[PDB]
Design a protein around this ligand. Structure first.
Ligand SMILES: [Zn+2]
Lengths: 48, 48
């Protein structure tokens, strides 16, 4: 369907949502690393 | 950079950047992370 261009309009919304979710996940990971560097979260809690 | 070091951790080796031939260590204690003489405390008096 994407190849023939039928569902590009419908799929764009889900594609953007997935991209935003992935960016949020990356930002959360970097935020957790920065939190460790600051010290607010211990190494044991970071693994969890 | 950004590493948590405990007391007694090895930091590095001494250099001779100031006076070649004789090695020394420039040791300075501050209350801020600046680069000037405004906020400097004598290390010997501080550790005393
Ligand atoms: Zn000096």
């Amino acid at each position: 369907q994407a190849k023939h261009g039928l569902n590009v309009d419908s799929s764009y919304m889900a594609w953007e949502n997935s991209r935003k979710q992935y960016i949020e996940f990356q930002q959360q990971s970097r935020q957790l690393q920065d939190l460790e560097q600051n010290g607010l979260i211990d190494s044991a809690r970071k693994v969890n | 950079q950004g590493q948590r070091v405990e007391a007694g951790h090895v930091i590095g080796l001494v250099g001779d950047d100031g006076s070649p031939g004789s090695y020394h260590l420039h040791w300075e204690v501050r209350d801020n992370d600046g680069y000037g003489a405004n906020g400097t405390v004598n290390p010997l008096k501080y550790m005393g």
